[PDB]
């Protein structure tokens, strides 16, 4: 009962497997997993030593690497995560 939730952990797991520790970390921050508060790439990139282009690069290569283990979880997960959905 206590400490029970398991809301969901599919897309997060399917994507992380392709991204390296450093690449995933940037998205971890962007996702708000590091502290629980989602931040924009500007906060993450600037936090390290790179601009949006770095995660921009990861998203690209991630897509290339995803074309094998997962059909396109990154796309759907990213689409569902942002305001790409119509209201």
Curated annotation (Swiss-Prot):
Subcellular location, record wording: Cytoplasm
Region (Sigma-70 factor domain-4): 15-68
Binding region for DNA: 41-60
Domain notes: Contains 4 domains, connected by flexible linkers. In the active conformation, the domains are in an extended conformation, each making extensive interactions with the RNA polymerase catalytic core.
Assembly and interaction partners: Interacts transiently with the RNA polymerase catalytic core.
Protein family membership: Belongs to the sigma-70 factor family. RpoD/SigA subfamily.
Record's function text: Sigma factors are initiation factors that promote the attachment of RNA polymerase to specific initiation sites and are then released. This sigma factor is the primary sigma factor during exponential growth.
UniProt protein name: RNA polymerase sigma factor SigA
Organism of this sequence: Thermotoga maritima (strain ATCC 43589 / DSM 3109 / JCM 10099 / NBRC 100826 / MSB8)
Species lineage: Bacteria, Thermotogati, Thermotogota, Thermotogae, Thermotogales
Residues of the full protein shown: 313 to 399 of 399
